[PDB]
Amino acid sequence: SNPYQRGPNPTRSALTADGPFSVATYTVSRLSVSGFGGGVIYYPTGTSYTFGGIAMSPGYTADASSLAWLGRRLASHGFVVLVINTNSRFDGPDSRASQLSAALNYLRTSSPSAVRARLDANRLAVAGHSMGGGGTLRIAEQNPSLKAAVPLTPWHTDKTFNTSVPVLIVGAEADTVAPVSQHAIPFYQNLPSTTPKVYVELCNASHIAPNSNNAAISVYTISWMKLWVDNDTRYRKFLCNVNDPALCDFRTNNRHC
Ligand SMILES: [Cl-]
Ligand SMILES: [Cl-]
Ligand SMILES: [Cl-]
Ligand code: NA
């Protein structure tokens, strides 16, 4: 059952480190693509399977290298992951949405053949840090064919996204760039009631928490991607009956359980 299932039955411990797939990397040069600033593709190798794809945006003033750990982490668990650079480091969230959109098209149609050979372009998702997370929400509303969206410490001046795409938001309790009371939490609250949604808040974390190896970010991001991109219900257990000392808030409409 479940043609999209990949990898062994997950343990929490396994979700805090790189997963069972070898990872190859491909540099998309800034100049080779119109529509976004290039970036890095992390993707499985040594395997004949195909996997869902993820496009991921860094945050305000940041480089793709800021999320290299997470692009590798996700790919190692069985995903083709393009972390973009933006046209300008100063691009705001809706610009970043457009670039995510361009990056998804690139992955499906123009990436190298070794990358295309590993991708099932019918199963795509988005993620992003900060302002890139605001772009993640925007694109999830503009393009409901996406399977999942994971905004990390998100920032956006618009607070309401009417998307049917399953959303997991990571807030940081001590975030002073994108305070959870103005940003992360309104975003969660204002999503449709009928959309599967989860909000997790990291205790004692700032806005820069996504920029380095983080166990909670790893577990929840992998789990939400597996659950919806792969329909992999083996990951429901990390997202249901949650009791996690790493978190200082948790909210869900429990449609995913
Ligand atoms: Cl092969
Ligand atoms: Cl913008
Ligand atoms: Cl197409
Ligand atoms: Na500008």
Author numbering: 2 to 258
Task: Show me the paper's own sentences about this structure.
After successfully implementing a batch crystallization setup for ICCG variant L50Y, ICCGY mutants were generated according to strategies to either increase crystallizability (Q6E and T110E) or, as a control, not to increase crystallizability (negative controls T26E, Q183K, and Q238K). Instead, two negative controls with Q→K exchanges at non-crystal contacts and without an interacting amino acid in range were introduced, which should not increase crystallizability. ICCGY mutants Q6E and Q238K did not crystallize under the tested conditions within 56 h, rated as “inferior” to the ICCGY WT. No interaction partner could be identified for the mutants T26E, Q183K, and Q238K within the standard range of electrostatic interactions (<4 Å), as intended for the selected negative controls. Furthermore, the crystal contacts of the three mutants remained comparable to the ICCGY WT. Furthermore, mutations T26E, Q183K, and Q238K neither resulted in unintended electrostatic interactions nor affected crystal packing, as the crystal contacts remained similar. The negative controls T26E, Q183K, and Q238K, which did not aim to enhance interaction at the crystal contacts, showed no increase in crystallizability. The consistent space group among the crystallized variants of this study (ICCGY and mutants T26E, T110E, Q183K, and Q238K), all crystallized in batches with identical conditions, emphasizes these assumptions.
Enzymatic degradation of PET using suitable hydrolases, like the leaf branch compost cutinase (LCC) variant ICCG, offers potential for PET recycling under relatively mild reaction conditions. Computer-aided enzyme engineering performed by Tournier et al. introduced an Ile at LCC position F243 to enhance the enzyme’s catalytic activity by further expanding the substrate-binding site. Additionally, thermostability was increased to 94 °C by disulfide bond formation between D238C and S283C in combination with mutation Y127G. In this study, ICCG was utilized for the application of a crystal contact engineering strategy to increase crystallizability and test the rationality of the applied approach.
